[PDB]
Design a protein around this ligand. Sequence first.
Ligand code: A1APZ
Lengths: 432, 432, 432
Amino acid sequence: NITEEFYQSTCSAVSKGYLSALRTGWYTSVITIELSNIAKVKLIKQELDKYKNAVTELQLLMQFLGFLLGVGSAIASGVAVCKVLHLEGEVNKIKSALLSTNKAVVSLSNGVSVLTFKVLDLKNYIDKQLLPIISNIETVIEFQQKNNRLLEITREFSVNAGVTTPVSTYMLTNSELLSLINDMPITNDQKKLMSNNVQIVRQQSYSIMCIIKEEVLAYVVQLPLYGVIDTPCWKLHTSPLCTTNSNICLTRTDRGWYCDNAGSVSFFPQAETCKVQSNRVFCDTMNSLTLPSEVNLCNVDIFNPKYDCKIMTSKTDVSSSVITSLGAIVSCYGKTKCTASNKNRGIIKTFSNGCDYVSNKGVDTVSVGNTLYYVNKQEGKSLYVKGEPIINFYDPLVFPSDEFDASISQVNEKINQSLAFIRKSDELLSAI
Amino acid sequence: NITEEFYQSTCSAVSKGYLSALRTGWYTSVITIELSNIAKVKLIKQELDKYKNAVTELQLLMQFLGFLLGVGSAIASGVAVCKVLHLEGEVNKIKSALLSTNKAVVSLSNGVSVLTFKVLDLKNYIDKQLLPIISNIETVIEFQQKNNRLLEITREFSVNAGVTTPVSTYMLTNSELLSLINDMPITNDQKKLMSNNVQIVRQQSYSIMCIIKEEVLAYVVQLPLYGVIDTPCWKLHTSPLCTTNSNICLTRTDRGWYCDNAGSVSFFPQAETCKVQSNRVFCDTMNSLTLPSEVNLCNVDIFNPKYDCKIMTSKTDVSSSVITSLGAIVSCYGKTKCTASNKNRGIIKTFSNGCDYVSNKGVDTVSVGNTLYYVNKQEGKSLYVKGEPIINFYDPLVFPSDEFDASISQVNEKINQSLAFIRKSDELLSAI
Amino acid sequence: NITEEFYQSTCSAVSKGYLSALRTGWYTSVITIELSNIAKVKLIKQELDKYKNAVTELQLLMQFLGFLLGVGSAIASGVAVCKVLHLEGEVNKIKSALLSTNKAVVSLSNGVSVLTFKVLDLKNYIDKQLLPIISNIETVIEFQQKNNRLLEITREFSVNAGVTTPVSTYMLTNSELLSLINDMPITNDQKKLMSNNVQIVRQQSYSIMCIIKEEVLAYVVQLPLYGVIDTPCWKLHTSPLCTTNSNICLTRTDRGWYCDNAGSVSFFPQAETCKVQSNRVFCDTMNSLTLPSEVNLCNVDIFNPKYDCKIMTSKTDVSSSVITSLGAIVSCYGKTKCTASNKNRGIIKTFSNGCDYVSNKGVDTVSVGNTLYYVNKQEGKSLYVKGEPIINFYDPLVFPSDEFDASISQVNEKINQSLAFIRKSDELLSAI
Ligand SMILES: CS(=O)(=O)N1CC2(C1)C(=O)N(Cc1nc3cc(Cl)ccc3n1CCCC(F)(F)F)c1ccccc12
């Protein structure tokens, strides 16, 4: 059940009812391809040239508040595992564990247990079916089918400098991926979540070309660990709130995704980086701040004493809309034409200057100036929370503008400083 | 005829002579693939496994001033149509309309008329040519050709979580796209514009994986509607204007594309998002503000009383160049070596400190510091508009710096406030 | 030998020991494909339809401190060469030079010498092997192999509007690319660098669809020229430094890559755009400022008199980490849990409020709040440079905040201005 509340007082809206699936860690697996080290004859010859060129190719290869975020190194974990694979005997240990089976767990020298997977055995095909020789066109066609995956994996690594994301189905098919997922050291809830959202897993994964040695091509596939699942998440949408006379504006800068997480709240300022499937919200904690849960008080009382709500101030009263989960915030200023239109695309509401809102219940589109917006048609209940625009409480003569990284308290203190000087001068001039 | 004017007074240039093609709306079409629900034998078997895996795969899938812009939901319209397709009988209505023909218009339950297109009939091939059985290698090769498009469409949807852009030729071939365009509910000028710029259409379109049901795979292709065409557009290029003594700077922040539109001007602050083909400018109104046409006065008189021109101020006098449509603005400060070189790449001009400009008439490259820039070699006429740099009119002792979201009037008022305090203190101290 | 120093006084770290490979220019080559202008029969027929559709398809196609950077036109050089190819006889001059050989140097009319390369001769295959006619399935399979490259090149150009980057192996194979590199007008050190980093070359190159005329399809491949190689580079990492009481913060804004270059320093503020292979740093001077070499003094003495070090100020004391080349800077404020954990992922250090640092020697991960970071496991020597946090030297009562584009001197002058007013008022009030 998605619900939404629009706060007329602060030109913002919160969409609730979502459930988290946060990427909190990384699981590293090792994917191997076993290789053979070596008219119809002419066709099979150039197909073998493609095989040989691909192998040497990989060998040559082997040789508003976003600014507050930290800086990670997203493939540090997989690169660390890849460095381990270059150590003496480490590849032979994997090649021995996969002689009899195609999937096995190996303990690496650095104290990390990895799943290994042999997804293609070109050694078996070339040595036992091709090295004897053609007579049959079926054999050249068959070789083209077995070789094609290696050729495409090589093409992908070649234009991506050895590191791909999302992980393609050439890197890992869906059968292989679902198989990997079922044996990961993770909870049953995690396996079910990953299996039902395999395309999101692919988008959050990396494939890291690693080593080609002892007739084994190995790459690391770095898959997300979802260590936070099924906690409540909510999306905060914000738009500029201006006077409508010489006008002053403020905007809540804390727009983004929020998810309850381990007694705090994970805040993702770039909402567009999260992926939303139905009511499940996939975000990456690398893109988050960890905030006190009192940050949510900014939605019910922006002047609350427990948390200093973030805002920016300006005098740039331009018109726009923010399309929410269940409706549309409209910031309409100056001479702009701002309307909402219904299922027959007849205008049913004309917005006055100010910040206002409509739900997707009877509205299909909103137009602000020359920009038409389609609203999301997701089912849910929207509530309009009436309130006097807080911009009305500010004296424009002492209003601090061009504040980007500001807050309620910061702005109040500047106002207090400005008023103190005026009161001091009026009394110092009257005494003189 | 492209022309350009450089304004020495404000370190900016306007390139004119372009014609608009603005994406203002969305047209939703439904693309269907009819499916069969079920040595040479071994080759045909695994090709059928690919077909079957692809089908279940899709079923698993089905289960400076940019900060002033609003926030849209770009696939709201297509997703809305896709939700309609999941309603009872809605797929059977499309499957019946396409039994006899491959393209037909269907009226959807939500009151929207859509073009539907059957681009591949795998049902017909598998049921009537493959289900009887091999003898012929031509039949296994033929099946590989018919199956390949489904396999590639599936691969594309798999790494893009069911939503692709640009729309590939696997999603829609050029014949199919040109066919679709010719029957859209659009003017003949729109059809001609789309047909002659099919690669831009592809880049502005979305493919949305929708439903697989009743032996029909359906995706929505969301194509741009160009509701503004052939109006004048112009590109504004801006660069920092600093004193050249302790130095102060300002930069016009309103750089971007401007197009006349419906009595106002659509302003696109991120010029790099628009696509330019010859003199035709493809921008998306989702990425625009709607401004009074008096915004253009900032190019002829930045102090004009009708529109408050936007600027940022600073003390960071670093050197750079802005390559324009027909030349190069050069902001050369401090000790930087700044030059322009001719067709033989001999230096023909050395820039002095300040903001200056050369046209592409005799210049192939400009170098600022260690950065070499190639200038665009588009034919056109450039005009150098002489004028005293406006930064010379500001007293640095009362110049407000670190103003990002500022304007001519805002800066003037801060200057006035600063001067008022100085005049008051000088008179209050003299009386004491 | 990579080394790193952490400056406790300024919450920053410098990673040293890297060597430059800067893209400073562009080399333009012309790549041509010679074309034929014209059950097994049914298979060969539709393969010829693909060939014909691809040809007409291309003919239709032919018809913190980043804000301080300038604006280039990255394909101006290649587009300039392409315009030359449309001039009368210019294509015939290339077609004659490639009749006997597949690679030749041609002097263009604009005074530029280009390497030309015939990578595929479909004219020879269609006219001499296909036009006589099928009997043999080998001939239809052979045609599918020769045609496939043209079909894929066309697909790539179609979804990229005629301009691709990185340059794929369909555009230029690795043999072709390595061949091109060996004959470029460049030093032997450049050839070796390009040949050993072909995947980086591909990522910095453009393919520009140019002309299809006189049975010749031609595209320009624009390859990087690395005119600065083997000079020292260093990476500056910075994180917010706040008091830990009402708190004030500053952050060094000059984070990014720095490379010695021609007596100055090339500064790349968006470090993520550079590519790092082992200790070689590939950056693009289009993404750089050219700075005095005294900018490096900010790392040893941020108050130095020779260069005015850049900082931003604020009151937003939120916690985060910056993962460096050899360790991790941790900015831990408020109630945040901040820890570092060892090879067995046991916590071995808990950070106090403030800015601190660990090396990758005994640490595998750092956690700040709900965000776990893996550190890079690159071998190297880290040095912790102790020093009193410079934020401790500022009186918070006169500290200017919300300064984004600021510097040490700018902040000092604002402080001086604020203190002057307070001292003047205290003396003017005491006299009254
Ligand atoms: C052209 S741009 O798109 O490159 N852009 C960078 C740009 C313009 C911007 O937005 N500001 C507004 C701003 N003032 C700030 C004050 C603090 Cl204390 C903190 C953050 C702040 N910001 C947001 C910047 C954050 C980042 F750029 F990193 F995203 C800003 C101010 C002065 C100079 C240039 C700019």
